[PDB]
Design a protein around this nucleic acid. Structure first.
Length: 400
RNA sequence: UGUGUCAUU
């Protein structure tokens, strides 16, 4: 800090005024100092005269280099966000110029700011607070090449994309949806810890659910088309995605959401059906298989059940079947528990059995009887395992 | 007996 602002202890003076700091030309020293910025942050929340604001506007968001330096600073980024807020609240003759300048500063450095731990916060605040027409311009400044992948998978920058999706109309970021849906991009992004979160957020915003009822019908049509395009791409690679350590959450989200029912059915038909035994033995895809059992429409559920009970040839020597394999498998056992719980819920009326113009209770009773018969026959081996004890207890609870 | 994300003074 400037010596004029210090005690004989080398400690920032108390009773310092905002105007002293503004007048001094030393603001940049305060704004990057923990104690100095703390003072500024408190001072700018109080009453400010027109000239105090004018000075803050000039010194904090008025020149590109100082704006970037504070925006990328651990302490200064807070002051930048505060001053942007004051600027937006001050409708004097300088308003338009200030906001255009802010848009220009940010746009010109968009990628670098998004990737920065602190400046990404300035971006997010600006996107939700600036006049919408200007916030849309920021979105336009996002890169469209490999740098956009870097942004999507970045620990900081992914939150910028999530903010865009939250507070900007789809038309402005539809290019991101098309970018992500490119086969090679989808692969990279979905297979990333942060990238998969970005894709899930996009899917959520593109869903015609209770949160989108305020869209005009024209906007709904734009959304439906973008969703259809993204789902086509996801469906084209669902085997790869379902089995992946991160992308399996995306497939689960789609399968689990009633508002995505048509896409749920595509996925089940495209990569799960005929692969249930194999996928049930996978660390990540076994969770997807469970969701499919839990949410499939009755006709597909019947096909799935039929596949487990009768879809596979028993081992030529031992006579072990798919059910034997899954019940004792480290991941498969949870799929079998899921099947049983579904059937018990249905028969005990915890799950609605009417669908497709028919009451399918008879089907659930049938599947339940097959499970009960297997569990009975194999009760001794099953009782050796937590999963087996659980199934035995599940059937015991139903009887009661 | 089996997986992630949810990040600044």
């Amino acid at each position: 800090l400037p010596t004029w602002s210090l005690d004989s202890n080398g400690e920032m003076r108390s009773r310092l005024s905002l105007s002293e700091v503004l007048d001094s030309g030393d603001l940049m020293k305060f704004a990057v100092d923990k104690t100095g910025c703390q003072f500024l942050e408190k001072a700018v929340k109080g009453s400010l005269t027109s000239y105090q604001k004018f000075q803050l506007f000039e010194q904090v968001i008025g020149r590109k280099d100082d704006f970037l330096k504070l925006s990328t600073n651990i302490f200064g980024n807070y002051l930048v966000q505060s001053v942007i807020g004051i600027s937006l609240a001050t409708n004097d003759d300088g308003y338009t110029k200030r906001q255009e300048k802010l848009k220009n500063f940010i746009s010109s450095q968009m990628t670098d700011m998004c990737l920065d731990k602190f400046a990404c916060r300035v971006i997010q605040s600006s996107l939700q607070n600036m006049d919408l027409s200007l916030a849309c311009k920021l979105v336009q400044a996002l890169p469209r090449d490999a740098r956009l992948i870097a942004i999507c998978v970045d620990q900081n920058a992914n939150h910028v994309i999530q903010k865009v999706v939250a507070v900007i109309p789809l038309k402005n970021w539809e290019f991101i949806v098309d970018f992500v849906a490119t086969p090679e991009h989808l692969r990279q992004i979905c297979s990333d810890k942060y990238g998969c979160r970005v894709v899930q957020t996009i899917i959520e915003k593109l869903t015609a659910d209770s949160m989108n009822v305020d869209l005009t019908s024209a906007a709904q049509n734009l959304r439906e088309r973008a969703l259809q395009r993204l789902m086509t791409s996801v469906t084209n690679r669902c085997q790869e995605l379902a089995t992946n350590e991160y992308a399996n959450y995306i497939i689960q989200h789609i399968v689990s959401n009633d508002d995505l029912a048509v896409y749920r059915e595509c996925i089940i038909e495209k990569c799960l059906m005929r692969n249930l035994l194999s996928l049930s033995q996978e660390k990540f895809a076994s969770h997807v298989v469970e969701k499919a059992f839990l949410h499939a429409p009755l006709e597909l559920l019947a096909e799935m059940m039929d596949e487990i009970f009768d879809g596979y040839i028993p081992h030529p020597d031992t006579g072990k079947d798919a059910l034997d394999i899954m019940m004792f498998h480290q991941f498969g056992n949870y799929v079998v528990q899921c099947m049983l719980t579904i059937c018990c819920d249905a028969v005990s009326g915890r799950r609605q059995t009417k669908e497709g113009g028919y009451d399918h209770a008879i089907s659930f009773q049938d599947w339940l009887k097959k499970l009960h018969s297997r569990v009975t026959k194999e009760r001794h081996r099953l009782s050796r395992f937590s999963s087996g004890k659980k199934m035995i207890e599940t059937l015991a609870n139903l009887r009661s």
